[PDB]
């Protein structure tokens, strides 16, 4: 009667009833945490402003007179230029107002200040004539220009002799004008600047504006009237005019005020769904529409400290009105006056709170509390400042996304934390009637190690089991009683030994390999007896209360009490760099890098022309030498006579030679 387990994988445990010595208890439903109240989002409309870098850009009209006078020396079949003087000349005030404005013409004469002198240039070197302004030729992507002279003047051919030819052209050319903050100078598309502020005048203290030019160069015309140079129909509108002359030209333009025309800020974006939140001592402005969150201090930014920010109010007012009348007008209602929070990163924010008609009951609170939010801090003390604005926007996209992801994931994580907690709490009843049914199993699964257990009233008493090797356990074949039939064992018989040499000890195989000491599990004998029992890592099958054979585990088809669960972590992912256009594509997109251009235009020498070489040439170095010295004495004499006083005594002499000789004849 010698039988051992097929698989010694799982050791047998002999586990006796315990004493009241050791005794343990279960936990109880730890009061589970609760949800958060959630961040209160105040709906509103936003409009965000940015530092202006786009220069102030306007229109003006230029008036000038190109004065080009040339030497020409002649040969037998040929004429060469000996020098071309080429100048830009201002047109006087009166000649613009009278000859150019009213009559659309211009003097053929120039009279202007250059190089500490007055000059007067005759066109053709001929008598002054009022000449006509005719439209400039067809020109592409340019302004509309005008001129009098379409071709310059040059003297008639006198064989081998120097002539001078004067030419004057009265040109009018309307142009654009650009200006950068603080707007004290302005440029012309001709590359010429004007060193005067574009808003100077006589009206509302306009003498305050800085101009280096003396007051007389520029005059302002109150209630001025303009007439087109081609159409020549007077403009219906009366425009206050301004006219400033330079040593090269004279420009005129229409005058407008300052603050309702320029602004350090500029309107950047319009958000109809901007959500304000208050957290950790700051506001976050989440446009769900454009995926954006903004960080602002609690107090509104004081607009007064905004410099020249009169664009702000007007712009924000118009935009917000249009949006609210469009899409919010019958669903919510306005709450308080608009707010100008300062957006971390240099983005000026206009934000309008608003509440639904659904819960207008609350408006009193909200209104008061919105009014609390602008400080009157500038009032008790004027020093002004600009707003420094960045050029990248990514903190807001990333910050929004991380808060929306963060919102969802932490939200769900919380919900499932609660659900798990209350599930484990809910189980203890199942574990409680279950622990009542079979104490040994539940106590072993609970404490962690295999132990005995018995109910000691409303508590559980335990004591550690005893390990027993499989090669030291015997199965006896029979399950019936030879002495008393009709009442036979319900579970097989085992003869284990606690030590490989230890005495053989009989017992009754119990559930889950517990080699119970007492042989007391008897049932009445019954027909059709098929029983699979637990033994070692496998099973042991008896038919009709008698040892059939031992089986491995997978011999029997297998089902499960388990609900599958399949999680895959998010694999890593590298983020490669990327620029849309590189900065060298931009320095290259600049059709001319002025730097490169001048760098070339100034090597116009050392490449193919030497400046480190000096030449002295003498015609007389090039009895006969003595005679040549004689003409030099004459040559040096003529030098004394090349100039005024020596020259005067000679003209007086020349008068004599011809005079005296003839009167005698």
């Amino acid at each position: 009667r010698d039988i051992k387990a097929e698989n010694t994988d799982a050791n047998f445990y002999v586990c006796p009833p315990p004493t009241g010595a050791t005794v343990v208890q279960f936990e109880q439903p730890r009061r589970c945490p609760t949800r958060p109240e959630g961040q209160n989002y105040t709906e509103g409309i936003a409009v965000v402003f940015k530092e202006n870098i786009a220069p102030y850009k306007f229109k003006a009209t230029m008036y000038y007179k190109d004065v080009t006078v040339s030497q020409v020396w002649f040969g037998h079949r040929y004429s060469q230029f000996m020098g071309i003087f080429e100048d830009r000349a201002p047109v006087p005030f009166e000649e613009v107002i009278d000859k150019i404005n009213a009559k659309g013409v211009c003097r053929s004469t120039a009279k202007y200040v250059r190089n500490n002198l007055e000059t007067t240039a005759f066109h053709r070197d001929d008598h002054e004539t009022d000449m006509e302004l005719k439209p400039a030729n067809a020109a592409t992507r340019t302004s509309r220009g005008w001129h009098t002279t379409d071709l310059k003047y040059n003297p008639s051919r006198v064989e081998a002799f120097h002539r001078y030819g004067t030419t004057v052209n009265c040109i009018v050319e309307e142009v654009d004008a650009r200006s950068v903050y603080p707007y004290d100078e302005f440029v012309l598309a001709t590359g010429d600047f004007v060193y005067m502020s574009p808003f100077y005048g006589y009206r509302e203290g306009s003498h305050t504006e800085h101009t280096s030019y003396a007051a007389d160069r520029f005059k302002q015309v109150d209630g001025f009237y303009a007439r087109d140079l081609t159409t020549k129909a007077r403009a219906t509108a009366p425009t206050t005019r301004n006219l400033l002359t330079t040593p090269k030209f004279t420009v005129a333009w229409d005058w407008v005020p300052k603050r309702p025309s320029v602004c350090t800020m500029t309107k950047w974006q319009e958000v109809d769904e901007m959500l304000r939140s208050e957290y950790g001592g700051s506001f976050r402005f989440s446009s769900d529409a454009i995926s954006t969150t903004f960080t602002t201090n609690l107090t509104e930014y004081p607009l007064s400290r905004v410099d020249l920010g009169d664009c702000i109010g007007k712009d924000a007012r118009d935009a917000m009105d249009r949006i609210f009348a469009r899409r919010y007008n019958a669903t919510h209602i306005k709450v308080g006056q608009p707010q100008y929070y300062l957006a971390n990163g240099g983005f000026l924010i206009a934000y309008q709170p608003l509440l639904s008609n659904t819960l207008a009951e609350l408006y009193v609170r909200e209104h008061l509390r919105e009014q609390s939010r602008k400080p009157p801090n500038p009032t008790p003390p004027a020093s002004v400042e600009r707003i420094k604005t960045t050029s990248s926007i990514e903190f807001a996209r990333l910050q929004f996304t991380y808060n929306h992801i963060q919102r969802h994931v932490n939200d769900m994580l919380g919900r499932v934390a609660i659900a798990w907690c209350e599930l484990q709490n809910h189980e203890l009843t199942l574990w409680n009637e279950a622990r009542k049914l079979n104490p040994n199993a539940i106590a072993s699964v609970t404490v962690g190690r295999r132990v005995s257990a018995r109910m000691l009233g409303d508590v559980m008493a335990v004591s550690t089991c005893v390990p027993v090797a499989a090669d030291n356990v015997i199965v006896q074949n029979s399950m019936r009683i030879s002495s008393r039939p009709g009442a036979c064992y319900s579970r097989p018989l085992v003869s284990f030994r606690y030590e490989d040499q230890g005495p053989l000890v009989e017992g009754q195989l119990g559930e889950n390999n517990e080699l119970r000491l007492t042989r007391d599990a008897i049932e009445p004998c019954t027909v059709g007896h098929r029983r699979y029992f637990t033994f070692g890592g496998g099973y042991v099958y008896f038919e009709e209360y008698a040892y059939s054979h031992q089986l491995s585990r997978a011999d029997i088809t297998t089902v499960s009490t388990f609900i599958d669960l399949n999680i895959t972590m998010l694999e890593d992912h590298e983020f490669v760099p990327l620029e849309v256009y590189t900065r060298h594509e931009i320095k290259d997109s600049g059709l001319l890098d002025y730097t490169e251009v001048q760098r070339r235009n100034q090597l116009h020498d050392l490449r193919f022309a030497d400046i480190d070489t000096v030449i002295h040439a003498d015609a007389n170095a090039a009895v006969m030498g003595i005679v040549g010295g004689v003409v030099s004495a004459v040559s040096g004499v003529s030098s004394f006579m090349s100039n005024p006083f020596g020259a005067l005594a000679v003209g007086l002499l020349v008068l004599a030679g011809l005079a005296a000789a003839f009167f005698a004849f």
Copy 2:
């Protein structure tokens, strides 16, 4: 016999058997939701194009003649310049083709149009001589230049008298040329522009191209041949040549066609793993390689409407061929003709679908369905357009990431939602045999409040329990029967009262503080009786069926049926701004801000030179006064004689004085 609970923390409940009045039932497995089919990703290869800002850049050759003529007036030991005329002159067509091209030389004479005149300048004021072109000096980061004259001319020294010195230099200089869309003008690295289109000619209707210049200035050479200026070996290739002259210079270049040379778009990126998805009426192109998703309308963009986008087809074809032959060629197969979807944000997309040999069975469908996707919308109506391309790329990284995060998190969230649902469904069996075992506990945990319960067939009947204070409950000491020994109580005896003054009412302490009314839980008396019982917030221990003492809870070692769960939400995180380089670092990286440069070069006056001061000086202001008036009359007379007709009568007079005097002698 007066005993009360150690801890009154938990009130006792007396809970009687119920009536059939109140009766409740359990829920049943709510059919759990199911997974989504998942978005079908169509593998393919992509190539994305962008607006061209890099100007069209090519090579050309300049030819000109610097004409510099100078006055020099002399003193005793010294010579001063009185004026330096300095001009740039064009080289005629023939002198380039004949003297410069074939012979590599150039005339020492200039003959060119300037200021409505023809001029002819002699080098040295000496007879025309064909002169040699020698290489320019060593120059760094420049082109390769050439010249004839390496040093200018100046007259010999004549004491106190004005001389003129002419100099002509024939210079050749090959340069780069840049051009911006629409490419009607092009620049030179010398800063000089040429107001003609770079593709003008006589071939395939090239008279269409706009040029303001008259046809005669520029000539095209069919089948032209070039020879190096230093190497002077003829180029093997025959190049159609173009030659345009300006009033300052003359440039020549090789001619090429238009559309196979320029393109409003430019190839930006090559993606071998671009995944197309269709969702919500749009396509999303997720390059897993570069972390990108693209949004496109359903229909392909019509390439024909792309302006000058003949670069597109060629480029995309070559690239996609190279990739597919490289890495996809034996695993997938091509599906349909390539596609040009328009990428929201202005990114033109070339996308090639493709399917695996694994499932080529489907190709018919896919092919047809891919062919359905380009519309023939331009055919029934030519108006063209450019593609406006942005300069930031972040919508795609953020949109990809949010879709991949979103994919993973919502995927796992769904899986666990299902698993929980079917777990709660799976539990009801446990709760069902468990609810059978001890109705009171399961009904109390279920309904939420402590109630009684008994099985009413296949359902459960309930009735609310009764609260009972602890200071109103007594434990009687004994647990055995004085009258009938051998059969003694299994649970202690209590004498509670429902009201602090209410009558004392006897009962038998039950499980979990239920003060059962009927005293009927009896077991046979047994040795070794140790029992911990539940009483109040604590326990009450009896030995041998007799009151020992009451204990607190933590007196007993504690185990648990709970599986720990530890979740931490994702802490907030602020995102600080950051620019790599600021825009002022770029306006500063521009080695010259042309704006700043001219702004300085035009204050070259008011800082250290006054223009508002005019000087009139008279030599005669500087009996003797009467004699001085006499020379003025002579001075003004000489003025009449300074000019032609007065001067003629004088030369005729001068002829007489010397003539008449001598013939008589």
Copy 3:
């Protein structure tokens, strides 16, 4: 006695006891996975450097002499300029060192090289006089300038005759100077360049630096001394000076060494909380402070290969010292020497590891292992290189965020995976005593289909049930026995039929619609008998062991064993594009696009002036014709006499006429 189910929704199953044929088993606790060790983050301090685009910017002083000489021709009431020569002249070395430096004055004479000639210009055409340098007028946002002449010279009025007027102005103007890598040329704010390296000299082999200029133009002053031009107090410091002259001007500056002055890199950011991680064969540098992660190869970048990166060491050293003394000095301690990892994307990284005093035990290891990390790869072979740095930073923000999100979400996902696994394992005990209580239910829920079950020892035997339609099942009214009272059925009686025509078969309704064949569930008769039973999709209520009536399900109030679970997936979200400022706002912010400016300044012709028109004019074309031909012969003769040799014979003749006539008188 004819009764059928109210709702045929749920089919009845007749399910008999099984045979030992079919038999199944449960799963066992699959050993659950375990947590990861987590990535070891090495704390440290970082400083990251970037390619320098900000040019090297310094100060210098310019010295020059504007030489302006003018023709003026006069009329009766008027004077016109005939040509204004205007030049920039260098001031010689000695005149700067002696006249300008020591004495703060300057010569009124210019003597300089231009156009291969020496020239000497007299101011006023008057004797040389040392003149004073007086401060320039008030000028805004300019440097401080100086000059001698504040107003130019012009000749006195001689009626109808050409005069020349010379003017020289000695101007000093200190300016800024800019320079781009490789720093061989440098610009001036005047737009003029200087084609020499800014670090050339005589000290420590400074003859190596490239200059095209000959050595004589520029001289270096060892131990130079400067004195302010207004304050005129000598500077205390002795500065080595450098003086280079150009053909137009002469500039001077103080000399400094090279490598401790310029650097291809530049300090970009300072991170006190930079966390290094090692993973997948690379390092990731996560500044938690600025939301950043960096990717680097294992080996440090060899600084020696950094070109001119002597700024690097000094800068990183100072910064890291300041931070560590500030905030880390008593909590951690330094580990090893600093490290220069090369940041993927072109960002040079200085990184200092450090460990806490908490666990300094480990330092030996860490130190050694940190020292292992810089390679000595450059030593066995000098070739140098720059570092190419990008202009966008987003890979780091997105990569950091995706790793922090990824960290949290995968972390929690893992924890809950484990918890679920061990929960399902923990349940099997509940399912095991529960499976013991009622085999049919647990086997049916387990296998998936309704089956029979009975305990076959330590295993379970099953056999499939039989479906039975509801319209084929009868409820008999009574529940008591007519023959034997006092002992009556516990569950109602049914007469089903397996086929719509099949014979009627009696049985006893069991739990959950099992139509048990054997009628053997009897209890003793009892008062107050109310029983709800399960029947069809509904219930069937008997009072006092007799058919009352059948009810629907919702007739009874309903409770639940289920813990609610509410998950919402993250809704999709589109990310719209966005630029802060567009590139056209930048080309527009450039107050002058030099490209646009010159493009306008070169159409100063074709719009309003025709160059394609040539004029030939003849005064003589404008008996009398014969007499006019006579003056032309004289006119052409005077041409022969307009020049030297013909002119000499005439002056000799003129000498005779007056001479001979008078001596005879």
